[PDB]
Design a protein around this ligand. Sequence first.
Ligand code: FAD
Ligand code: FAD
Ligand code: FAD
Ligand code: NAP
Ligand code: NAP
Ligand code: NAP
Ligand code: NAP
Lengths: 417, 418, 416, 416
Amino acid sequence: STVHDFVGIGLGPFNLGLACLTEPIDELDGIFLESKPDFEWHAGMFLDGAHLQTPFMSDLVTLADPTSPYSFLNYLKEKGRLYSFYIRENFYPLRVEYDDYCRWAANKLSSIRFGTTVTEVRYEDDLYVVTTSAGDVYRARHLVLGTGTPPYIPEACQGLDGDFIHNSRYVQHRSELVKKESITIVGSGQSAAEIYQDLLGEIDVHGYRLNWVTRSPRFFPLEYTKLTLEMTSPEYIDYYRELPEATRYRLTAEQKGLFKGIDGDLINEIFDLLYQKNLAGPVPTRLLTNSSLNSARHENGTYTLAFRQEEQGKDFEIESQGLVLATGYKYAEPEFLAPVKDRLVYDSQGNFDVSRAYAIDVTGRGVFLQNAGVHTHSITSPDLGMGAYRNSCIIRELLGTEYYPVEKTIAFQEFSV
Amino acid sequence: PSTVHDFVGIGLGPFNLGLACLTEPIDELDGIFLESKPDFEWHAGMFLDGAHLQTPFMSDLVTLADPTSPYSFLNYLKEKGRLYSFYIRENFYPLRVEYDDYCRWAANKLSSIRFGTTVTEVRYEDDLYVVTTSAGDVYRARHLVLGTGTPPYIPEACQGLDGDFIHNSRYVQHRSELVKKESITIVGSGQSAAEIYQDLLGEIDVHGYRLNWVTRSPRFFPLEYTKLTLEMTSPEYIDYYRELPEATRYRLTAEQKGLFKGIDGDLINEIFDLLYQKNLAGPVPTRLLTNSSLNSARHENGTYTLAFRQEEQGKDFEIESQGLVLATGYKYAEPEFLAPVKDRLVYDSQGNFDVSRAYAIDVTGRGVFLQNAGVHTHSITSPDLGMGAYRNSCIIRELLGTEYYPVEKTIAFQEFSV
Amino acid sequence: TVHDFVGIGLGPFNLGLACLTEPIDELDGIFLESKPDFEWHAGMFLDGAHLQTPFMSDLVTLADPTSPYSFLNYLKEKGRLYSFYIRENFYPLRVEYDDYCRWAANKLSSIRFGTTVTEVRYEDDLYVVTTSAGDVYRARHLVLGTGTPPYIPEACQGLDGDFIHNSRYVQHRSELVKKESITIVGSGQSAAEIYQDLLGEIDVHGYRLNWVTRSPRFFPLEYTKLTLEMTSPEYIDYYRELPEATRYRLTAEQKGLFKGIDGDLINEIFDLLYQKNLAGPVPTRLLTNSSLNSARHENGTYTLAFRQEEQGKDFEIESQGLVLATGYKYAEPEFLAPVKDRLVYDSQGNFDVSRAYAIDVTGRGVFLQNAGVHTHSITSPDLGMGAYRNSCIIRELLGTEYYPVEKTIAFQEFSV
Amino acid sequence: TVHDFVGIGLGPFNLGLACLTEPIDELDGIFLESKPDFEWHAGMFLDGAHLQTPFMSDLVTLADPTSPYSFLNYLKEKGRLYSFYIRENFYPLRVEYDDYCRWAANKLSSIRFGTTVTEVRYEDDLYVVTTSAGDVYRARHLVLGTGTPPYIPEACQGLDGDFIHNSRYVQHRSELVKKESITIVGSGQSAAEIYQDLLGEIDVHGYRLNWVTRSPRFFPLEYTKLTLEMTSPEYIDYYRELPEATRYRLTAEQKGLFKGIDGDLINEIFDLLYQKNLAGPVPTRLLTNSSLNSARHENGTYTLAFRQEEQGKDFEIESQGLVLATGYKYAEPEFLAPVKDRLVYDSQGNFDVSRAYAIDVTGRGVFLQNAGVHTHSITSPDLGMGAYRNSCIIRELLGTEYYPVEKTIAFQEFSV
Ligand SMILES: Cc1cc2nc3c(=O)[nH]c(=O)nc-3n(C[C@H](O)[C@H](O)[C@H](O)COP(=O)(O)OP(=O)(O)OC[C@H]3O[C@@H](n4cnc5c(N)ncnc54)[C@H](O)[C@@H]3O)c2cc1C
Ligand SMILES: Cc1cc2nc3c(=O)[nH]c(=O)nc-3n(C[C@H](O)[C@H](O)[C@H](O)COP(=O)(O)OP(=O)(O)OC[C@H]3O[C@@H](n4cnc5c(N)ncnc54)[C@H](O)[C@@H]3O)c2cc1C
Ligand SMILES: Cc1cc2nc3c(=O)[nH]c(=O)nc-3n(C[C@H](O)[C@H](O)[C@H](O)COP(=O)(O)OP(=O)(O)OC[C@H]3O[C@@H](n4cnc5c(N)ncnc54)[C@H](O)[C@@H]3O)c2cc1C
Ligand SMILES: NC(=O)c1ccc[n+]([C@@H]2O[C@H](COP(=O)([O-])OP(=O)(O)OC[C@H]3O[C@@H](n4cnc5c(N)ncnc54)[C@H](OP(=O)(O)O)[C@@H]3O)[C@@H](O)[C@H]2O)c1
Ligand SMILES: NC(=O)c1ccc[n+]([C@@H]2O[C@H](COP(=O)([O-])OP(=O)(O)OC[C@H]3O[C@@H](n4cnc5c(N)ncnc54)[C@H](OP(=O)(O)O)[C@@H]3O)[C@@H](O)[C@H]2O)c1
Ligand SMILES: NC(=O)c1ccc[n+]([C@@H]2O[C@H](COP(=O)([O-])OP(=O)(O)OC[C@H]3O[C@@H](n4cnc5c(N)ncnc54)[C@H](OP(=O)(O)O)[C@@H]3O)[C@@H](O)[C@H]2O)c1
Ligand SMILES: NC(=O)c1ccc[n+]([C@@H]2O[C@H](COP(=O)([O-])OP(=O)(O)OC[C@H]3O[C@@H](n4cnc5c(N)ncnc54)[C@H](OP(=O)(O)O)[C@@H]3O)[C@@H](O)[C@H]2O)c1
């Protein structure tokens, strides 16, 4: 029956931003399929005071069209909170506020189908046939994959017994963790430090042991200096994508400090808190680096975790009743892409050889990939501050026209000669 | 010549320009704006290097009334190809030259502005306000929105003073002359004076002049910018402040000076650090004096003879300076062109415009609207860029009868009235 | 046995005088403290609370950085100097500063704890100080350092119930958080710290939280560096020489210079209000320009009659908890009754403190720590000027200037 | 006359040793310095330049806060203590620290300025130190503190023209701004301060400003407090015990821990670029990943051959002015030639500095200040660990501890 211009699979910030940007475009009509009954953005990490790491301009539309009615500032105006935000004079919205803002934006759009899980994608008669778990079938000429990056746990914890959790479900399991006699957090990303700051603040009223163990060499901060922020730019992606595949993969091993790590102010608040608590006596906490969790066993409601200090070359074990795996996220190719696997391009490492224009299929403009492209677009791939730019390039290729102006240079420095 | 507009805006500063930007998509409103200068220009004499706004960029021409408006600072940055650079800069306060460039950019997009037009006479006839220009043109409108700003103020001691002294509003144009002199004296301790002092103190070793900073103020007090005090820049505080007695309001205007005047706290601290840095190499020939009012001045032998009095201590003293920079502020004066319609304007017991809560100054309560110059009725919000959109939205509401842009009634956590 | 001086009270100002006078052998002093050990406003030991002056304003440093009683040498001895080095924060925590003073007073032998002064007499060119236990000390000079007791409004004198002055907040916090409603009177630094503490857990206990003050705004502590130059020797020289009526009118105008709120705490309070208001309306009220004029206690509930002094309207507030954060005030200690004929007073009844911090007819017999805002402006209760004042006292007691006393420190001139 | 030790060189580390050993009567030391007086990188005395470590990292404070040679006591003597207190900045200006170090050296009795060491011999179980003037000193121990001389790329060895290393920038600034083009090579803190200085006057002189660096990014100095805990005694113990190949790999991947740009300075450079770009296109280039491989001089211009080592592309830059901010490197001094057999080397040819900072076969005869990143990681050139290493050196010299040597300062653990 009906054949749309494109189907959006998943409705996270990137595909929702595409939905807000394509809604006023008449000659371009797409639909978005989302498994959840409504938008929801990492609710398990809705800690008190938690905020974005990027300014409010990295919302769904502003960096492409500040006049769009779905901007964060327009959302604050409708809620009667714009003047209060003006006085707050903070660039970073709280996560619970950004999540409510996204739900508010998705509710203004009619191109979204909530409660719809894509289970099969087929290519028939020059059309992509999308089938959902409820049996509904959609057809279109292009696809925009925005399924995000699911949680990642070390394989040493796959099949582990007990009540251990990934950080993506921390808030729902907080009441149980604070009742235990010991808690161990694995990892040292931003989520680990937030949870560590959270549990360390109440370490007196509960009396547990708090262990923070990570494989990284240091609790390194997020490199947020402005000359480095210029690498989140179109001209750098131009230079980075043209590099040989071996150079891009070697860079990704050394560029994790540019988009991961801990907020510098959070590290300093954690030290200040440690200093404050230690005035009343020794604090029952441990912080270890260069230690990789290699195996874990459960018994009597207690975990025996085996680490190896890879730098020192020594093994040690830690016993703890609570286990929070703040081990990050990792993309895996969705199973619904199996019938069209022969139409998708791959690189010499088994991952999608994403084009400069964010395409992953043989035609070069049929299947578009949101996120999951660090090996081809560097730190800009999961960046909320580049979602409107990427959606601009996707709109430009889908439409042929540059509906939203796409900047070619933004940086004072040059990366290529 | 046969047209009757809904209103005529007199003067095109940031407040009336914001009204122009906000009424442009309103078809039921027919406005026209008359500006003396050939183009927009915003205190160009204070375009010192690095100088920036005291209010975040959301206090632009439209955003607090309509973030979706095409005349916002963010949309302007997007069009200039600078939006991502400002994103990385991560600074709420635009440069002054940047804000000026943005306002000229927005005025160029409108069709309702007549530049090079100086209003000389306003008359009332046939239930219409007749506005004559210096070129002889005549515009008729049902309403008026007055936005002529606040001209410079100099003390009575300097009226009819000889020499090359300057008010701070002409500093950038006279800077290359001032740095040649043997001594410079700054009078006043507002934000303008401190910016000039820092600029001249930064080059004190390159030019070898004495640098005097003398103020009538009791201290170099900072701009009170803490957030609970910022909540007084709100509509609910205006509701409270406006309905206070006239004597109470005039007393608060004398005491609320540190709320919207004074110096940025960061600038005061950077001044001290620079004094500390320069003092390492030897005595810095600079004087910082407070509680001292300039009572008399004369220009003889090519130099100035300033007579001060330390009002708190009660002792007179003199300062000799070849340069004189009066950073003594601005003050509104009733424009001459309103003379033929003073019978239709409402005044308080002090002789100033008894500006209504809805920003009207005429007898009907909705014919002549006043931008700025309303501190005695609207407190610190009167010259605040962060309340221009709010005032214009109330003005638009009185012109239409309907609230085109939503007008917030409460924004603050605290309460001011019981 | 007759000493050179007897110090009455052992707060930070007399303790600093103790550490500064220990190496001076030509001075014999003794200090009498009522309490068993040193304790500094322990009722305000809120979590994270810190000083409002940098650590260089400790007991000795601004007079002698080499003294062994410095905060830095204290940290060195506690194995915490390097951690403090990484902390890179000028402001010690309040519990830390209390522990530091306790560590310093207790390294000295000139302090007699558990000793309350009851009467002071002048008998043949000597000051004779008798204690509550009957013992008697004689000295040629006296150094009064008894501090400033809490102040409560007249509307609360003889008030029934369990209300507290903020100076006893830490002890009574467990019971206040049980109540259905809490009202804070005042808007100083103590009131805002308590408000921030109670607002942080307003969801946990679900009480209504009121913050009503007589101040016109929640004005911040004016802390910019050019204003800090008024905490200088040259400003006291200028301020003390002003006419007494000028000084008294100035004290009403310089409240924001030392009796406000830390600007960052004000901003933290607004952000917490903004944060909690996302979930729903926060049951809190913040009112200004309101004076507490009468209070009554009925069935564990307080009825507080307020008047908005600017608007001119009365209003009431019902609250089960009442925290008076209404500041402190110096009262003439009754043990000075026999020597009142030797003390100099001004036209308003307060001690006419000389520039050299003396309050007796000889200009060098009785010295007053603190309680001198009307003569020395904001420098009187300032920990940053405790070492300067003590070196001037030592200068009078010695005849020679032991510790170098700065004459000018500021870039600006206050006097012409 | 045979002393207990001879100090060779008088930089901050050996000057600190001199202040810490002055009150030790059981120790007889002497220090020999080539300069007529103390001078600390005066070629980098740009206006506003400050230390990157707090003032507690002075000559003595972290070992003995009571020492009369502390920065705070220097400020007291200069009548500048209160103004510094108002300044409330942890970082002294470089001109200030240089004046303070000169002040401390003039108070001491153990320094011979204008004395260059030309030879070191070992005979009769003593070290023989011969100066260029022919004077001969004997002592049981030696402490080497000759610093790290400038390093320039070998592509600039024997280069013609008026090019300079950044060590001499202030002396050549007047002539640099007259040229039509200036190129800075490298991206440490030195290069960034120079770029900011020249960019600030780019509208006054009309040169083109080039900033090219082999570094992959203009990375900031990692200064967050959990990383600062790696500058600690416990991290040195863990680090030194690691295998030698592991230590040499860490020195390559820890340049951002002490050899970056101050984060505030990066953001200021970007803001200045934003500001000046408002008026028009600013004539400046910033390039990374580019190594300088060849350089030749023509008339009064330089032709520089660069290679972007990542993109794999050669390019050239035409520049009249050349400023090499390429860092510093320790080379073994020639005066150690006769005693090389008594020194210990590792597999790479560098000194195998022990945990107690010794480099001689006896493990306690010759100590090395600085020049030990491969053995003590980022603490080796750090002013914040100068008093600690000097306290250990004094412990080895005196046989036991004189100043308290902390065993643990951090909250985290590095060894398991
Ligand atoms: C706690 C946290 C905070 C972060 N903060 C920031 C920040 O401040 N700035 C920044 O730049 N980055 C940030 N990131 C990184 C990144 O921007 C986010 O992870 C972001 O959510 C990624 O957007 P996405 O749409 O690609 O993924 P997601 O938000 O995970 O979108 C995936 C969506 O697709 C749906 N879906 C999945 N499979 C199917 C299917 N088969 N059919 C239909 N729907 C499906 C899912 O239900 C989900 O709604 C943060 C990440 C985390 C975890
Ligand atoms: C240097 C400086 C910086 C400031 N920065 C800020 C800030 O960051 N934030 C803030 O909130 N406030 C700020 N202010 C205060 C205030 O917002 C400004 O003074 C602002 O320019 C006032 O706008 P206005 O339109 O009322 O006056 P103006 O900008 O002065 O507008 C008056 C205009 O009307 C024209 N005009 C006058 N008479 C006539 C006539 N008869 N016919 C025709 N045209 C006429 C004039 O030519 C002029 O263009 C600043 C003030 C100064 C001086
Ligand atoms: C919570 C709080 C925090 C403050 N923080 C700062 C700050 O950071 N910086 C600053 O500059 N100022 C600060 N102040 C203000 C002021 O410096 C302090 O109040 C300071 O404690 C005053 O010192 P004092 O010795 O004069 O008074 P106190 O510290 O009160 O000393 C009085 C002492 O004398 C004893 N005493 C009283 N009567 C007798 C008697 N008859 N016989 C014997 N002993 C007696 C008392 O038991 C007590 O020990 C703060 C005040 C408060 C309340
Ligand atoms: N709005 C916000 O503030 C916010 C909040 C959360 C996340 N984010 C962003 O989301 C992204 C991910 O953040 P994240 O903190 O959730 O995850 P993350 O940054 O990827 O951190 C994962 C941590 O787990 C460690 N790890 C992995 N496997 C391990 C093993 N076997 N044993 C021990 N440690 C192991 C990793 O060490 P290695 O270093 O060796 O890999 C790493 O330290 C980042 O880009 C972040 O900026 C932002
Ligand atoms: N965006 C920006 O950065 C910026 C720049 C400039 C201005 N502004 C704002 O514009 C407004 C005016 O600023 P402004 O600094 O130009 O003026 P101002 O704040 O009014 O300062 C005037 C100074 O001159 C003093 N003075 C007046 N008459 C005197 C006399 N006879 N003798 C000695 N001193 C005398 C005044 O002392 P008294 O205190 O006794 O009156 C006062 O200190 C302010 O609200 C300001 O915030 C903002
Ligand atoms: N280490 C620290 O950070 C720290 C902590 C606490 C205190 N301090 C210092 O200790 C001193 C005292 O602090 P504080 O906050 O406890 O006292 P405070 O500064 O004197 O504040 C007292 C408050 O109570 C108000 N008040 C007085 N009588 C009232 C009445 N009848 N009705 C309503 N309100 C009334 C006052 O309003 P009015 O303005 O009208 O008088 C004032 O707002 C200050 O100098 C402070 O800087 C420092
Ligand atoms: N307190 C202060 O303000 C201050 C001031 C100056 C210095 N310092 C400290 O002194 C130490 C040295 O600082 P520094 O800035 O003088 O030097 P530096 O940190 O060692 O920086 C040297 C720069 O020159 C580059 N380089 C070397 N050879 C090159 C070549 N052939 N071609 C291109 N680039 C080349 C290096 O690239 P690579 O990255 O590949 O090596 C590096 O970027 C640091 O620890 C610093 O913290 C402190």
